[PDB]
XYZ file of C-alpha atoms in Angstrom:
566
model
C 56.952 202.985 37.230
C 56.806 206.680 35.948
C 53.732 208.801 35.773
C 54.729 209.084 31.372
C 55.103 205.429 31.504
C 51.833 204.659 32.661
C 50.133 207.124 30.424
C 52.040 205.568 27.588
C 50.678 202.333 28.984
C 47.085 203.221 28.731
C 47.333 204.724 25.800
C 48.215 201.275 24.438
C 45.784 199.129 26.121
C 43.115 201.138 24.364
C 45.146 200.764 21.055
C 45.146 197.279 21.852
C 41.621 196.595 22.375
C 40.351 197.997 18.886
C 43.666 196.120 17.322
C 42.118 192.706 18.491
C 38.359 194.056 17.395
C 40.327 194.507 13.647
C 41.777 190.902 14.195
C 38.284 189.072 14.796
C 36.583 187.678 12.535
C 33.340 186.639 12.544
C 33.818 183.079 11.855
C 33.047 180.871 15.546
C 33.441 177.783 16.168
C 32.129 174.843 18.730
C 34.533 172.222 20.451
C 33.556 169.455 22.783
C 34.994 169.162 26.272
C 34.637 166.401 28.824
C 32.374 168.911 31.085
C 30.439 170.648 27.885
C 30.753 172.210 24.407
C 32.894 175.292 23.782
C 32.466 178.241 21.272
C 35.539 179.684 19.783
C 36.065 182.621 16.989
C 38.970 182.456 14.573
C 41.559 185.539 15.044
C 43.733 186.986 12.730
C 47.443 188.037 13.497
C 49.100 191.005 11.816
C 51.277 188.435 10.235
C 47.779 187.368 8.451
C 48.066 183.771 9.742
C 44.767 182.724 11.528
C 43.868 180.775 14.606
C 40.422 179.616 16.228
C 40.846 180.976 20.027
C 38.796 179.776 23.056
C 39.492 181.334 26.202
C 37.467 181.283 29.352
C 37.470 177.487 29.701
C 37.481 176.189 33.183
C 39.006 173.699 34.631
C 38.165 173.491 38.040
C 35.385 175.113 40.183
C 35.424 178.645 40.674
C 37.179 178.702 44.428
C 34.772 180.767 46.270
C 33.317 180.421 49.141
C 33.813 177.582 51.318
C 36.179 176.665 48.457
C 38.752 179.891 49.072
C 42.240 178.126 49.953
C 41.096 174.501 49.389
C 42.801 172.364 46.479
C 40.921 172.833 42.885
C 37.457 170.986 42.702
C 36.182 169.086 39.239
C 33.892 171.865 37.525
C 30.467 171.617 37.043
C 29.359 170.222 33.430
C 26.787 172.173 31.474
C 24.552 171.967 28.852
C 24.356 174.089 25.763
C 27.658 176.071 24.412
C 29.827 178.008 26.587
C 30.828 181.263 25.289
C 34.874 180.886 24.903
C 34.826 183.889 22.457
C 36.757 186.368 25.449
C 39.008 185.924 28.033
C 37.798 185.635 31.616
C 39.640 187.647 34.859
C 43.221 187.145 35.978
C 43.855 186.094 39.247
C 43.429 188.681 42.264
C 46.853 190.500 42.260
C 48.660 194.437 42.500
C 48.870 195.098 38.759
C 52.613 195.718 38.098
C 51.994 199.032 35.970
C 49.433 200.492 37.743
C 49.659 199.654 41.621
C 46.249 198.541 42.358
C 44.799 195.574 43.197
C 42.902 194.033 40.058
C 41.554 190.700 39.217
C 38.991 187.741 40.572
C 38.838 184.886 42.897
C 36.827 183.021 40.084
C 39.925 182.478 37.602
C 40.093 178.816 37.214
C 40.326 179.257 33.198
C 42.671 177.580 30.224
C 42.898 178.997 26.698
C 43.447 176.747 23.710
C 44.663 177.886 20.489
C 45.379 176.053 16.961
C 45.254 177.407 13.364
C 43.058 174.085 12.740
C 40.556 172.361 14.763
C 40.297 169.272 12.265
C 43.946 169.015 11.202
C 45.033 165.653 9.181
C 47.471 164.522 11.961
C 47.364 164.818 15.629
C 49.395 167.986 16.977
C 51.583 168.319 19.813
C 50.397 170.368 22.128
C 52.475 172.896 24.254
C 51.282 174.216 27.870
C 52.509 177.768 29.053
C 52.997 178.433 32.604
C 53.001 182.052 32.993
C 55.762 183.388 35.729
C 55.274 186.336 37.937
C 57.017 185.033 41.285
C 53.490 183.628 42.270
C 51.903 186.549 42.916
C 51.159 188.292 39.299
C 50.334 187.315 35.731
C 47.695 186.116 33.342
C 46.707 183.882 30.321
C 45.431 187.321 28.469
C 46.848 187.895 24.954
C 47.996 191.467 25.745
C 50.659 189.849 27.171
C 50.584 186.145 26.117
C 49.451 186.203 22.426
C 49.830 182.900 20.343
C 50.317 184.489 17.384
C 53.474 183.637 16.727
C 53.229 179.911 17.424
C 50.323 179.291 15.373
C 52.034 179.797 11.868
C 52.683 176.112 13.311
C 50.860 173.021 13.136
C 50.840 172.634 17.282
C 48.251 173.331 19.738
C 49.412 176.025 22.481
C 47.766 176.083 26.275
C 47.499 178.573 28.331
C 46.265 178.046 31.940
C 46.074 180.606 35.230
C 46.573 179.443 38.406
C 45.598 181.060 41.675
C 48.200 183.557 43.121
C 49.729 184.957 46.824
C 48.098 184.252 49.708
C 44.633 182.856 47.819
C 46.654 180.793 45.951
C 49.199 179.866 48.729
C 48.117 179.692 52.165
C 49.322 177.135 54.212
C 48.376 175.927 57.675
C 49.671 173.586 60.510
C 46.550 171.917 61.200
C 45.048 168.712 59.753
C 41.812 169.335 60.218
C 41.529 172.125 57.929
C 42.641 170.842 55.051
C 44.422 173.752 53.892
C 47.913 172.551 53.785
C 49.514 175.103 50.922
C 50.245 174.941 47.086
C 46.558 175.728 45.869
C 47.761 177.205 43.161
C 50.228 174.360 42.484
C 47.371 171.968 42.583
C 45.595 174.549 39.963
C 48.523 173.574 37.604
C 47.602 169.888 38.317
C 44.129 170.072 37.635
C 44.438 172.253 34.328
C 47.265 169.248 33.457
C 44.891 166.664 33.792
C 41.944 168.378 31.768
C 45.168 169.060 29.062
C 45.753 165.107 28.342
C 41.597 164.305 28.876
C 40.396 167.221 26.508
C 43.438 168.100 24.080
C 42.472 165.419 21.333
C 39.058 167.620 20.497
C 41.296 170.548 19.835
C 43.603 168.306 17.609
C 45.955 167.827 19.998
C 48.013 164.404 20.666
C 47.918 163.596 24.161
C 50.763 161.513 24.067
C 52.937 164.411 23.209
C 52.195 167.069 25.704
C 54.987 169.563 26.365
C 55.227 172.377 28.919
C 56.738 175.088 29.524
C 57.373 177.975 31.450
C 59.511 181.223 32.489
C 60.526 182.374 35.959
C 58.105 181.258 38.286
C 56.688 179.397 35.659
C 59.360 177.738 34.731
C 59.705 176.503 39.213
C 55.613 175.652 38.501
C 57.407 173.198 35.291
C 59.723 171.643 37.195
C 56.946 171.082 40.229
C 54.622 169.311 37.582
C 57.973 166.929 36.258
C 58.667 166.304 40.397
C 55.321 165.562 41.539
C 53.680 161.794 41.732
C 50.056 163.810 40.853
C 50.874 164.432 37.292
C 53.337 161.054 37.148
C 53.042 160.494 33.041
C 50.727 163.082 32.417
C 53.363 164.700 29.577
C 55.944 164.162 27.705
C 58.991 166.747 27.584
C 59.315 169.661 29.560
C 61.392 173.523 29.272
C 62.911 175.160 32.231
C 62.825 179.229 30.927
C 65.590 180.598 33.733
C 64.075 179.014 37.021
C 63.809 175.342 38.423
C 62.189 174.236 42.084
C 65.502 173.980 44.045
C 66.106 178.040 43.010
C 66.360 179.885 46.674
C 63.256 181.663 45.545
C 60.831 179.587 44.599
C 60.040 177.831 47.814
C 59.335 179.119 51.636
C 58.061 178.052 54.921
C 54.857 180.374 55.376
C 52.444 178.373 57.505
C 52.882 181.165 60.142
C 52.245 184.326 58.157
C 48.563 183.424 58.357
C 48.122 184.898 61.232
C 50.219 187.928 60.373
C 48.247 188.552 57.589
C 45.025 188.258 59.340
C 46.060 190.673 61.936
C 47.003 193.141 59.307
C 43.099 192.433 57.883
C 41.708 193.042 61.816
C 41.793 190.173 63.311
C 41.388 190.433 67.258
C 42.167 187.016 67.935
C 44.598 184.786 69.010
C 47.206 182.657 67.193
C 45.019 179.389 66.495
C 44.864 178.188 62.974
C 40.829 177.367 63.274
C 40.036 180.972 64.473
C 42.937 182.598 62.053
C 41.031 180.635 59.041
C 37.938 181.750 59.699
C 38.624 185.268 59.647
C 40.640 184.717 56.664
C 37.602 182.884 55.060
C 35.462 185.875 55.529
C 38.175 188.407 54.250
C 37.368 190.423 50.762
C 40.237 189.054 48.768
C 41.232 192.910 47.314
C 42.198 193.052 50.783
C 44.213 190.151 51.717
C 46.313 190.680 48.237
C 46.794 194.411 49.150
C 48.065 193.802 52.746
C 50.017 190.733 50.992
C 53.699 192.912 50.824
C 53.437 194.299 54.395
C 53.173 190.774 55.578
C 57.247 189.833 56.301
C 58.582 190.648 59.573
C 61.576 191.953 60.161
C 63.565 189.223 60.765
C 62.292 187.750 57.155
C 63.446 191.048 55.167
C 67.108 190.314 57.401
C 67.154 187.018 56.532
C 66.135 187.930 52.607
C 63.078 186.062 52.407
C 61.451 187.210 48.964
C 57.604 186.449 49.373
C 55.636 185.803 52.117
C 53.259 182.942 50.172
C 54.273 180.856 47.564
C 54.680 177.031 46.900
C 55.638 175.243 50.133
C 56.707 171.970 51.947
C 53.394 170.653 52.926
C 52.990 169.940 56.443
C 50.902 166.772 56.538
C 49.518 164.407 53.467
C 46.604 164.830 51.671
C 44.995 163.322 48.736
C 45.903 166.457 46.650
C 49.282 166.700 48.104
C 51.860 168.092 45.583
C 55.143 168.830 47.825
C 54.811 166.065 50.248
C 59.284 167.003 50.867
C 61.375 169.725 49.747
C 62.063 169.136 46.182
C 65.707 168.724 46.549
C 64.620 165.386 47.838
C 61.688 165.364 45.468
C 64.219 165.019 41.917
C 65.773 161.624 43.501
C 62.650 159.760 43.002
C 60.881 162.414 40.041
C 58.893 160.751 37.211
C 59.783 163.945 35.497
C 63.487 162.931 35.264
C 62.883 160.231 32.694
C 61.134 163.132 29.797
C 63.431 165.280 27.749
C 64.021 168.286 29.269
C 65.420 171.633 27.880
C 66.941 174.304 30.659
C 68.386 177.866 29.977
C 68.943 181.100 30.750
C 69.259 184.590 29.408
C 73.224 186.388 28.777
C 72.186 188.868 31.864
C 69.541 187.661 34.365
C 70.389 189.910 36.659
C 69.646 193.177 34.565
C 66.027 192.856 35.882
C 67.610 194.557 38.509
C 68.223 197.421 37.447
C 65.892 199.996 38.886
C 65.492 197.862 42.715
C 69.745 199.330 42.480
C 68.556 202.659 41.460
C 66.498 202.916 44.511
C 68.582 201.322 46.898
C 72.181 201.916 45.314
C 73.675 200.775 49.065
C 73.129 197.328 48.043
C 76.613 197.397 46.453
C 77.986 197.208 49.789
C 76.682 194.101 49.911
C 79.614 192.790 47.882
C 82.334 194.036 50.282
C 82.223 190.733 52.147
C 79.388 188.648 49.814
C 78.543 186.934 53.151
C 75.091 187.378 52.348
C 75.002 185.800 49.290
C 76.514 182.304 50.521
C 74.275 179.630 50.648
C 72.103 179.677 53.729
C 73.011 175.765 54.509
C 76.464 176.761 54.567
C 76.266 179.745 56.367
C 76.625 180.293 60.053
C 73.625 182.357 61.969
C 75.072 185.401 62.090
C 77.360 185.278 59.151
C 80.404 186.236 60.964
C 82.332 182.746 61.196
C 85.755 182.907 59.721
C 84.723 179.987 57.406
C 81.376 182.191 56.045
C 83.386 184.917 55.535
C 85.637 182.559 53.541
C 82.852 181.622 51.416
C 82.022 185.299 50.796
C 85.494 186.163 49.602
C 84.801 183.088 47.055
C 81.864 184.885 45.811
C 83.360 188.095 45.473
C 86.555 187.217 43.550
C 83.796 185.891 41.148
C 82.152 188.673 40.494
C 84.010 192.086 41.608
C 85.963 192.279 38.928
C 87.742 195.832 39.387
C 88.948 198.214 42.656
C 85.413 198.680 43.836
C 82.006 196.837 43.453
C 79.920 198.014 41.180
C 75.960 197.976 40.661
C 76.856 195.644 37.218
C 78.747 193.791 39.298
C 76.123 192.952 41.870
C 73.266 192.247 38.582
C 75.915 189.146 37.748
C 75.833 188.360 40.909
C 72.436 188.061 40.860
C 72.294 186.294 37.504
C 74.186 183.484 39.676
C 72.657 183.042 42.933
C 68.837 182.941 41.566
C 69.302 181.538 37.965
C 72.984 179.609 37.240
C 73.880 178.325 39.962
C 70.809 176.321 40.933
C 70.785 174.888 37.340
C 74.392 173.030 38.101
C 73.290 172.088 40.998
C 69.701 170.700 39.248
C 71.764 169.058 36.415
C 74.613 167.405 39.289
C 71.484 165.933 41.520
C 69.554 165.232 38.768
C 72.220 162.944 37.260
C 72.210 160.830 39.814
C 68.158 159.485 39.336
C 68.206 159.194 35.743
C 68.581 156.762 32.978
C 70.207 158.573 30.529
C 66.869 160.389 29.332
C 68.738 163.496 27.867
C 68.685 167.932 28.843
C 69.616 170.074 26.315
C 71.051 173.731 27.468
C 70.242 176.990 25.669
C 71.222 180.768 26.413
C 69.560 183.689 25.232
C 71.536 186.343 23.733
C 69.519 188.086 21.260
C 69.506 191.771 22.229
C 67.287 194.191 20.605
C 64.923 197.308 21.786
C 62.835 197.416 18.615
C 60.694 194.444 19.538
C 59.978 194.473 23.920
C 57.449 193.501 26.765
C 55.957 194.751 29.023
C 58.717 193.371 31.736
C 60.777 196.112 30.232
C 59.211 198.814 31.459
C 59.112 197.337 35.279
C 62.923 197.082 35.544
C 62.997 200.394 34.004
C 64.946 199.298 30.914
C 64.002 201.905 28.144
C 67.428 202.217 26.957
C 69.191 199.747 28.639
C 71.256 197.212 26.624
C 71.614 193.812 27.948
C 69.650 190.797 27.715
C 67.359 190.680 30.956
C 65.363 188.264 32.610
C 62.137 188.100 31.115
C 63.704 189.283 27.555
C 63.252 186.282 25.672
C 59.338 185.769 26.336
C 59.405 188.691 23.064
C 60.013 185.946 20.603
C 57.528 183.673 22.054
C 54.306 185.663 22.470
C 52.651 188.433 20.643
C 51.672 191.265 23.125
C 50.405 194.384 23.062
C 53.387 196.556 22.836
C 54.259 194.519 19.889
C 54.622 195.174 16.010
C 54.725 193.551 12.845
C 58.548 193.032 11.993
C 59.613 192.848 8.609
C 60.221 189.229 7.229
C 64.253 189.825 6.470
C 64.663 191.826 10.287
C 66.429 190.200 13.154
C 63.861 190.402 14.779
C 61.470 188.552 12.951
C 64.109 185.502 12.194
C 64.124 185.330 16.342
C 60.756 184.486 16.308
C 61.449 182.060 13.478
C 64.269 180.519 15.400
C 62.773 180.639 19.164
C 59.373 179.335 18.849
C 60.658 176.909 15.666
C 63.252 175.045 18.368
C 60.905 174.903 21.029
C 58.035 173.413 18.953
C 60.851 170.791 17.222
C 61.887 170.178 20.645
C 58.306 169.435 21.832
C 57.554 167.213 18.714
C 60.909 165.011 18.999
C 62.306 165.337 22.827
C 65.460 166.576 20.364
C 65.437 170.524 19.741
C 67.591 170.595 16.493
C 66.143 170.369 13.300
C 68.049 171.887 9.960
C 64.853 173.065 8.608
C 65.557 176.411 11.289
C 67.516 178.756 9.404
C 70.705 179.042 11.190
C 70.665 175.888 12.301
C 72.028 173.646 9.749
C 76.038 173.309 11.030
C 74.278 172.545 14.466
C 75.413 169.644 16.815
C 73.900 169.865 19.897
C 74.620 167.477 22.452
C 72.663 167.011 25.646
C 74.748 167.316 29.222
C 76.849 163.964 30.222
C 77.139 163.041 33.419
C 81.025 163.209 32.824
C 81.078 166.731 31.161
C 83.024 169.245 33.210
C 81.862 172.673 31.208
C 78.923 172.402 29.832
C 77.992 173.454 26.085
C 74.472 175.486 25.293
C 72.997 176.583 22.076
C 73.889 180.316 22.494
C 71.103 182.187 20.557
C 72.367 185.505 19.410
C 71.802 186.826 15.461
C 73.815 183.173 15.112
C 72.646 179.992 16.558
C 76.234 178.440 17.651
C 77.020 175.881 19.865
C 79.756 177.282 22.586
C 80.728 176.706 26.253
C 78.545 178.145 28.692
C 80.283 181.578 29.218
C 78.996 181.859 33.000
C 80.919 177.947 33.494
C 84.309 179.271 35.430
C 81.988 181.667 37.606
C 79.679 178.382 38.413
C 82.475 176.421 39.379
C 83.772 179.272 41.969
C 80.145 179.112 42.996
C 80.448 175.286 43.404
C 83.929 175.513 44.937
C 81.793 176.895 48.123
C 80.821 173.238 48.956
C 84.235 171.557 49.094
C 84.256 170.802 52.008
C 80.720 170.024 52.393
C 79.940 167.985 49.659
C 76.826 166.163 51.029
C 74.800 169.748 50.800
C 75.851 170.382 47.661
């Protein structure tokens, strides 16, 4: 991120902060919780639609102390009224603008928003589960604002979890009872005080919905594949991610000791003695050290992050991943809730500046051999069958004399995004009942209307819908404006948050009351469908074949011949 960029950045987070001062009013408000009351204050939007706002709730224990890398504990009930009336810290993480470590260990928090704390009918209530590849993001309204769902009668959630190595540490040994996913079993926790507490907000706790991009939408799948949160909601929306993508998962119970060593630690390779250092760490540090943490052989092999959600190695009472979720979908509760999956029209745009530093990536596609699946790959990716499988890959995607850097972002779009939703939707098949998914793909470009996530890939300018793109015409944020009612942009927002909110009411996500919608017939995926159909959402909703479908089925043709991996 530039030196301008940054000063344009903190120009608007003090913008920002008098905005919301201008939006407060001084109307507050108290809720009841299972653990204590709450105090709220009702917030205006620049829309001038209204909604009471309590942030700061926890949900667990603040996980400090002896409690760093154990799973969430119950929180501590209090008397009196807790102040909800700000938002607490974000989880201890490298901020993406700035570079420098920022954040808390004590981030356990929800927020719960709803234009009307005593409506005349119970709400459904939506949970957000920010992304950030498990190692950034937040529940602040800077860059999660529910201003745009609140012009609706719902109730919108949402939680923090803990992040990198705090949130993600796993070790061997059973008698330290830190076996990975803390931050996983956050999501659990803040799930079950969701259906307990929602009701006092309004909220119907038999229609619970959640949601979530990127990472977050791997943490949505998690919470629909593991037996801890077996009926705790109701439908759920996969925002371009699932668990079986190659990057949501890793084996990282022997990093601890890598990171320690890069902390000091003069000691030997024993998890007891590599805990306790760890235990005494300051946590700026650990997070800091967090990126030098992959060996060599990882960065060959194209391991992404060191910590994140793993394949526990023993059972515990908290245990979310007890197998890799691959095996996890053919007995998930999860399967049996409506479910909603998509992606945007060019995933792989969030590339763009990592090609700008390194443009020698594009060799990469001379042979594709490593992009082929890692189960079907030999070791040292120079079997005549691998490189086989690489020429499969490249016919799909080098489409002229020489690879290009575009070529290699579709590429991308496929390997992290596409192609693990087929192979979701084939498995998945398989350990259902019929309960239906629905496909959507984003396809709304515009620059007048952004996020933040713009200015990491270095996309002023850039045309293309990107990863990360659609999350716009869900949340207000701070580089936000008010859009006028008749502007595409506006009717987005309309359409976006209007589908997924009819779509968490109904388990169905048309209704004719979206403008745009009304010649709509949107079928789920069948079993028996060879291309599938999405709602494409451009400045026309229309239902079409998934344009990406031929490319997926080169993808697929990879496992011919091994059919059982696929």
């Amino acid at each position: 991120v530039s030196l301008m960029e940054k000063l344009k950045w903190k120009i608007k987070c003090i913008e920002n902060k008098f905005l919301n001062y201008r939006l407060t009013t001084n109307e507050t408000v108290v809720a009841e919780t299972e653990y204590g009351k709450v105090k709220g204050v009702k917030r205006l939007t620049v829309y001038d639609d209204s909604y009471y706002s309590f942030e700061g709730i926890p949900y667990a224990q603040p996980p400090v102390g002896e409690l760093r890398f154990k799973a969430p504990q119950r929180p501590t009930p209090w008397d009196g009224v807790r102040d909800c009336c700000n938002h607490k810290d974000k989880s201890v993480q490298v901020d993406f603008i700035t570079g420098k470590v920022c954040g808390s260990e004590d981030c356990l928090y929800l927020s719960v928003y709803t234009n009307n704390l005593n409506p005349e009918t119970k709400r459904p209530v939506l949970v957000y589960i920010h992304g950030g590849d498990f190692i950034i993001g937040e529940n602040h309204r800077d860059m999660y604002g529910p201003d745009y769902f609140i012009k609706k009668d719902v109730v919108l959630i949402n939680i923090q979890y803990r992040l990198g190595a705090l949130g993600f540490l796993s070790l061997n040994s059973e008698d330290l009872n830190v076996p990975g996913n803390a931050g996983l079993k956050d999501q659990v926790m803040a799930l079950r005080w969701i259906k307990n507490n929602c009701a006092n907000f309004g909220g119907n706790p038999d229609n619970i919905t959640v949601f979530g991009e990127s990472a977050g939408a791997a943490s949505t799948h998690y919470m629909m594949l593991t037996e801890q949160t077996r009926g705790l909601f109701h439908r759920g929306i996969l925002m371009s991610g699932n668990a079986i993508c190659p990057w949501a998962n890793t084996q990282c119970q022997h990093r601890a000791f890598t990171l320690a060593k890069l902390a000091g630690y003069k000691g030997e390779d024993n998890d007891k003695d590599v805990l306790e250092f760890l235990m005494k760490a300051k946590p700026q540090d650990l997070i800091k050290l967090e990126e030098k943490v992959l060996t060599l052989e990882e960065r060959t092999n194209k391991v992404v992050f060191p910590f994140g959600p793993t394949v526990e190695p023993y059972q515990t009472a908290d245990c979310v991943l007890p197998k890799h979720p691959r095996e996890m979908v053919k007995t998930a509760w999860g399967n049996s809730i409506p479910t909603m999956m998509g992606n945007t029209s060019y995933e792989g745009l969030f590339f763009t500046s990592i090609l700008k530093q390194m443009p020698m990536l594009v060799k990469e596609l001379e042979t594709c051999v490593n992009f082929v699946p890692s189960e079907l790959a030999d070791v040292e990716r120079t079997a005549p069958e691998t490189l086989e499988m690489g020429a499969k890959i490249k016919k799909a995607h080098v489409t002229g004399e020489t690879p290009t850097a575009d070529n290699f972002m579709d590429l991308c779009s496929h390997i992290y995004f596409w192609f693990p939703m087929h192979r979701l939707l084939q498995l998945r098949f398989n350990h259902t009942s019929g309960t239906p998914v629905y496909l959507y793909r984003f396809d709304f470009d515009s620059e007048d209307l952004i996020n933040p996530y713009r200015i990491m890939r270095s996309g002023r300018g850039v045309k293309g819908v990107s990863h990360a793109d659609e999350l716009t015409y869900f949340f207000w944020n701070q580089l936000a404006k008010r859009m006028p009612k008749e502007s595409r942009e506006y009717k987005t927002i309309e359409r976006m948050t209007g589908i997924w909110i009819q779509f968490a009411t109904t388990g169905n996500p048309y209704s004719n009351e979206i403008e745009g919608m009304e010649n709509v017939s949107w079928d789920p995926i069948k079993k028996s469908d060879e291309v599938y159909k999405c709602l494409n959402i451009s400045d026309e909703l229309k239902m079409i074949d998934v344009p990406e479908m031929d490319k997926i089925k080169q993808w697929e043709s990879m496992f011919e011949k091994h059919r059982d991996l696929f």
